[PDB]
Amino acid sequence: HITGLCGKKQKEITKAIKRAQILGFMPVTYKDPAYLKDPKVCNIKYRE
Amino acid sequence: ANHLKFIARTVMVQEGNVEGAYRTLNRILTMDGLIEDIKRRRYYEKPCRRRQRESYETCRRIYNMEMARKINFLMRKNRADPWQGC
Amino acid sequence: SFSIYPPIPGQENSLRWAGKKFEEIPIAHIKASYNNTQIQVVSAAHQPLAHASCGTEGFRNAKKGTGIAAQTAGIAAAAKATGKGVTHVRVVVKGLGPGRLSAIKGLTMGGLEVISITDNTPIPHNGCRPRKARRL
Amino acid sequence: AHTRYFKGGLLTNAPLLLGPGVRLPDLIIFLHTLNNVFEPHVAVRDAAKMNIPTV
Amino acid sequence: ATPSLRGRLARLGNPRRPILKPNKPLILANHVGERRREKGEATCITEMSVMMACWKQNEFRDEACRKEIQDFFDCASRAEAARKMRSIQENLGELGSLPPKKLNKLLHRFPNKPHV
Amino acid sequence: SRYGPEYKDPQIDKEYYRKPLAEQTEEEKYERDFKKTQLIKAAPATKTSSVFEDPVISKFTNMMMKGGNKVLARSLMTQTLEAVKRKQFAKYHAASAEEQATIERNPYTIFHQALKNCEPVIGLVPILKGGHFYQVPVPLADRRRRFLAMKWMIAECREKKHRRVLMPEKLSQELLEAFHNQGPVIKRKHDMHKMAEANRALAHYRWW
RNA sequence: AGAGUUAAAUUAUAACUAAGCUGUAAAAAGCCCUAGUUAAAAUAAAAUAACCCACGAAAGUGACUCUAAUAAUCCUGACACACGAUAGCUAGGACCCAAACUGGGAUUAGAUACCCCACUAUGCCUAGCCCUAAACCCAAAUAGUUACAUAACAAAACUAUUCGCCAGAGUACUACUCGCAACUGCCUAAAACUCAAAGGACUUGGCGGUGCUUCACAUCCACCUAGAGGAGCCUGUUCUA
Ligand SMILES: [Mg+2]
Ligand SMILES: [Mg+2]
Ligand SMILES: [Mg+2]
Ligand SMILES: [Mg+2]
Ligand SMILES: [Mg+2]
Ligand SMILES: [Mg+2]
Ligand SMILES: [Mg+2]
Ligand SMILES: [Mg+2]
Ligand SMILES: [Mg+2]
Ligand SMILES: [Mg+2]
Ligand SMILES: [Mg+2]
Ligand SMILES: [Mg+2]
Ligand SMILES: [Mg+2]
Ligand SMILES: [Mg+2]
Ligand SMILES: [Mg+2]
Ligand SMILES: [Mg+2]
Ligand SMILES: [Mg+2]
Ligand SMILES: [Mg+2]
Ligand SMILES: [Mg+2]
Ligand SMILES: [Mg+2]
Ligand SMILES: [Mg+2]
Ligand SMILES: [Mg+2]
Ligand SMILES: [Mg+2]
Ligand SMILES: [Mg+2]
Ligand SMILES: [Mg+2]
Ligand SMILES: [Mg+2]
Ligand SMILES: [Mg+2]
Ligand SMILES: [Mg+2]
Ligand SMILES: [Mg+2]
Ligand SMILES: [Mg+2]
Ligand SMILES: [Mg+2]
Ligand SMILES: [Mg+2]
Ligand SMILES: [Mg+2]
Ligand SMILES: [Mg+2]
Ligand SMILES: [Mg+2]
Ligand SMILES: [Mg+2]
Ligand SMILES: [Mg+2]
Ligand SMILES: [Mg+2]
Ligand SMILES: [Mg+2]
Ligand SMILES: [Mg+2]
Ligand SMILES: [Mg+2]
Ligand SMILES: [Mg+2]
Ligand SMILES: [Mg+2]
Ligand SMILES: [Mg+2]
Ligand SMILES: [Mg+2]
């Protein structure tokens, strides 16, 4: 409901996130600082 | 604990107002359903007791979305009526 | 684009309170438990400069859980920390409890400054089995 | 013409509603088969019950 | 987006096995849930314990501190004004939505059809 | 309550009516007042437009009454204002010029200063939780506390004087000792505040 | 089904700091070889993704990677054959956490419980059993159709081919039998006796120490005033006389 992807692409995104985390490509507990300023895909507005 | 500290769930005050900051924070942790999970992991819940909660929550969200939906779709006809006292 | 909250460990950013980098500013560890709140202000080098509890504050088994006692440990903690010369604090709140907001305003109320608020709450990704729920 | 809220027993119970004895419409004509809650309008069923033709 | 109602429930046609077990049938009900009245907090506590500090240090002479007291009574007056205003505030609703009555006439204009 | 809801209260003050021409919203207000055909209450017999009545004195007087005697209470109040007045004369004529600048010989401002000083700031209400009654700190509205002070004064001087001691004398004593904060009335006020502090945590029990 | 791997947490155990820490509606007990912070393996368990609806015959299966791998040119089918959650048994390991039990503490007329504190078998791995669940989606399998049609409710109503099962209620997941690595077990399963019912759904009330809204105006709480219950005496009951 946020990303807005098909089932396939969501599942691949997720399997991918996990696989990037345990092998050591990506941090688990936060977004990497470098990428905080990237383009914004999602529909979440945190700050109001 | 093995990740770099202070990068996780951090918000820094701007213009010295602490209260509003803590508010933004709690809004976040609530956005992700972290508060929920904390209050939930205070105690255990057996798996049965869990699937019950799941289904209930889902039915409730369906009814909600639907209700909100008929509400907002009907929002047009709530204006002052044309034909009154025919 | 002003005051983006997460200052990076990289040196790309220069912002100084009391001249010190964000990394040099002494921490305040606030544990808020359903039954208690205890504040410890520590150096960036992790040597404790202050410790104050609701039970070290003059309260007892029940009311020590309350928010009044949280702002109360807040003030005396901020004063014993002030005496050793700490102006600023970046805060980390361990636990979701009665004394969270109360002690966090209670620090600034005892004449201490707050800059960062982060949350370190234990969040099992499914580690240990928590104790049984209570009605049973 | 009856264009208005339709009192439930109008055709079914005429003598009490309309008068001590009364003659009833020989022909009903509907410009809509619905009432504002989108149900079949009563008078369909009622006329049908009352041996009256309807157009 | 609405969570799919496809294949979830237990029916005689269903090849799969139940996802959702509904407590009550899922139908949009004609009425709407009424306004849920909010609870109260403990108001003015800050000036309360501020003045408690003021008294435990001053040996309980009120004359020693005029200020804490006055801010405490200004706070109590703010809370009373807040209670009267929250009583006459019934026009509140959700502010951008409608009060439950108007919703209910609105829906009893366009009901949902279980029957026929 | 022989009056319907229709009957508005009498405004007994002479000064409001005598000087109408400088106020716009007030001219509008008492115009809307008497133009509406408002049935207006018969003004009370106890209240008078007299320049010598203080509704504070009025209510302490009333609160001191027993049975149907307005007379006996009006007299005991006369004798108390009298005892305070003449006693302040006795303290004034035995003193030195500095203290002849300091001392207050007005029993009226001594009364208002005896009640303003005796007034407890917070007061306790019992709340039932988990089967226990806790006394919790409550912020109080002005009038309740006014009542509190007056009642305490009356109660004390009815209670703790010896049988030869007259009422107005004792009340003059406690009025004067309340002026300077050293009488048992402010002791009750201070025990109110001490008990208000010991339990202050429980103020989180307060839902209003 | 293997083989390897570990992200957050927890804990050993050290170093600083504080004397308290834990716990409930409220308290005690308990621990102060305790708590906070900083460090850290082993075991266990697998946030979020999931508002998804895949896989497996069912039980089941949602941390990571790879190897092996999902019967049948496909109707039905047993007491035969192979499976089967939890708990349980046997032997060998494991033990952060949880926890029957037991022991303290409260709660109480009592509390063998609800509430707190410990702590064990026990959940975990390897081999072997035990073969039971509300093992339920209480809806048999395989073709079909939406034609006829509403006992009631609920998952609308039916044909066709099957296989399993049901002859009042108890007695009874019982007594006897047979078989089974069980020997307080499982399976299969009666009768004497007793009753005139037992049951499914439903309707109206009444009630609910259920939830929600709005109230009580001398009225429940908060608040105001004056009394009763103690004394003498008047008068009415109740016992004795
Ligand atoms: Mg650590
Ligand atoms: Mg780790
Ligand atoms: Mg969820
Ligand atoms: Mg999980
Ligand atoms: Mg049970
Ligand atoms: Mg399947
Ligand atoms: Mg149900
Ligand atoms: Mg294995
Ligand atoms: Mg540790
Ligand atoms: Mg509690
Ligand atoms: Mg003890
Ligand atoms: Mg989930
Ligand atoms: Mg599923
Ligand atoms: Mg293969
Ligand atoms: Mg196959
Ligand atoms: Mg098949
Ligand atoms: Mg077959
Ligand atoms: Mg088994
Ligand atoms: Mg076992
Ligand atoms: Mg063993
Ligand atoms: Mg063990
Ligand atoms: Mg070990
Ligand atoms: Mg343990
Ligand atoms: Mg016991
Ligand atoms: Mg009892
Ligand atoms: Mg109970
Ligand atoms: Mg242990
Ligand atoms: Mg197992
Ligand atoms: Mg099952
Ligand atoms: Mg079921
Ligand atoms: Mg199932
Ligand atoms: Mg069955
Ligand atoms: Mg049955
Ligand atoms: Mg079959
Ligand atoms: Mg057919
Ligand atoms: Mg019927
Ligand atoms: Mg039989
Ligand atoms: Mg059985
Ligand atoms: Mg048997
Ligand atoms: Mg056999
Ligand atoms: Mg009464
Ligand atoms: Mg009553
Ligand atoms: Mg009496
Ligand atoms: Mg008596
Ligand atoms: Mg007799």
GROMACS .gro file of C-alpha atoms in nm, chain F residues 48-153:
model
  106
  489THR     CA    1  -2.872   4.699   5.009
  490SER     CA    2  -2.724   4.967   4.778
  491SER     CA    3  -2.580   5.120   5.095
  492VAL     CA    4  -2.222   5.238   5.062
  493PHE     CA    5  -2.146   5.047   5.387
  494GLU     CA    6  -2.221   4.685   5.282
  495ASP     CA    7  -1.951   4.432   5.192
  496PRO     CA    8  -2.083   4.103   5.046
  497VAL     CA    9  -1.777   3.943   5.208
  498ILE     CA   10  -1.894   4.067   5.546
  499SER     CA   11  -2.240   3.963   5.432
  500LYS     CA   12  -2.146   3.599   5.372
  501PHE     CA   13  -1.930   3.563   5.684
  502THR     CA   14  -2.220   3.711   5.880
  503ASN     CA   15  -2.464   3.468   5.722
  504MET     CA   16  -2.233   3.168   5.776
  505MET     CA   17  -2.219   3.255   6.144
  506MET     CA   18  -2.597   3.254   6.184
  507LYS     CA   19  -2.774   2.982   6.379
  508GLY     CA   20  -3.145   2.907   6.363
  509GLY     CA   21  -3.342   3.202   6.238
  510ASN     CA   22  -3.131   3.475   6.397
  511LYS     CA   23  -2.993   3.737   6.157
  512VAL     CA   24  -3.003   3.968   6.456
  513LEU     CA   25  -2.768   3.770   6.685
  514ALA     CA   26  -2.516   3.724   6.402
  515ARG     CA   27  -2.533   4.091   6.294
  516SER     CA   28  -2.464   4.175   6.658
  517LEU     CA   29  -2.171   3.931   6.702
  518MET     CA   30  -2.020   4.074   6.380
  519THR     CA   31  -2.076   4.428   6.507
  520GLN     CA   32  -1.895   4.332   6.829
  521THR     CA   33  -1.609   4.165   6.636
  522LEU     CA   34  -1.551   4.462   6.402
  523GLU     CA   35  -1.570   4.670   6.721
  524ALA     CA   36  -1.319   4.458   6.917
  525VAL     CA   37  -1.072   4.462   6.624
  526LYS     CA   38  -1.114   4.839   6.573
  527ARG     CA   39  -1.072   4.947   6.939
  528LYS     CA   40  -0.796   4.690   7.001
  529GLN     CA   41  -0.606   4.836   6.703
  530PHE     CA   42  -0.656   5.174   6.869
  531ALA     CA   43  -0.505   5.024   7.188
  532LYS     CA   44  -0.203   4.900   6.989
  533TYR     CA   45  -0.174   5.237   6.809
  534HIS     CA   46  -0.174   5.464   7.117
  535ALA     CA   47   0.083   5.253   7.305
  536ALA     CA   48   0.331   5.261   7.013
  537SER     CA   49   0.604   5.474   6.850
  538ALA     CA   50   0.554   5.706   6.547
  539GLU     CA   51   0.711   5.459   6.298
  540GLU     CA   52   0.457   5.196   6.404
  541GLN     CA   53   0.195   5.477   6.400
  542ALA     CA   54   0.270   5.487   6.027
  543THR     CA   55   0.267   5.103   6.005
  544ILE     CA   56  -0.035   4.984   6.214
  545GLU     CA   57  -0.372   4.924   6.042
  546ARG     CA   58  -0.675   5.065   6.225
  547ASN     CA   59  -0.925   4.969   5.952
  548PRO     CA   60  -1.109   4.647   6.058
  549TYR     CA   61  -1.242   4.612   5.701
  550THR     CA   62  -0.905   4.592   5.523
  551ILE     CA   63  -0.779   4.385   5.820
  552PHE     CA   64  -1.070   4.143   5.756
  553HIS     CA   65  -1.004   4.116   5.380
  554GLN     CA   66  -0.632   4.073   5.461
  555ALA     CA   67  -0.717   3.809   5.725
  556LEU     CA   68  -0.912   3.599   5.472
  557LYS     CA   69  -0.681   3.659   5.170
  558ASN     CA   70  -0.393   3.527   5.382
  559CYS     CA   71  -0.585   3.230   5.531
  560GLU     CA   72  -0.692   3.094   5.190
  561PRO     CA   73  -0.542   2.751   5.103
  562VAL     CA   74  -0.418   2.731   4.742
  563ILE     CA   75  -0.483   2.362   4.668
  564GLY     CA   76  -0.715   2.115   4.835
  565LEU     CA   77  -0.767   1.742   4.837
  566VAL     CA   78  -1.037   1.518   4.696
  567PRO     CA   79  -1.069   1.147   4.772
  568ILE     CA   80  -1.067   0.918   4.467
  569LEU     CA   81  -1.150   0.547   4.467
  570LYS     CA   82  -0.900   0.328   4.289
  571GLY     CA   83  -0.834  -0.041   4.336
  572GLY     CA   84  -1.045  -0.022   4.651
  573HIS     CA   85  -0.848   0.258   4.820
  574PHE     CA   86  -0.934   0.622   4.881
  575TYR     CA   87  -0.642   0.843   4.792
  576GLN     CA   88  -0.642   1.213   4.869
  577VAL     CA   89  -0.536   1.393   4.555
  578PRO     CA   90  -0.422   1.752   4.496
  579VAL     CA   91  -0.692   1.960   4.335
  580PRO     CA   92  -0.662   2.315   4.197
  581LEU     CA   93  -0.953   2.510   4.350
  582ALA     CA   94  -1.180   2.788   4.221
  583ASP     CA   95  -1.186   3.119   4.411
  584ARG     CA   96  -1.528   3.095   4.572
  585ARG     CA   97  -1.477   2.746   4.717
  586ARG     CA   98  -1.160   2.867   4.886
  587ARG     CA   99  -1.332   3.184   5.012
  588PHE     CA  100  -1.583   2.952   5.172
  589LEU     CA  101  -1.297   2.743   5.303
  590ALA     CA  102  -1.130   3.034   5.485
  591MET     CA  103  -1.452   3.173   5.632
  592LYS     CA  104  -1.574   2.833   5.747
  593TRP     CA  105  -1.240   2.751   5.907
  594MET     CA  106  -1.246   3.079   6.099
   0.00000   0.00000   0.00000
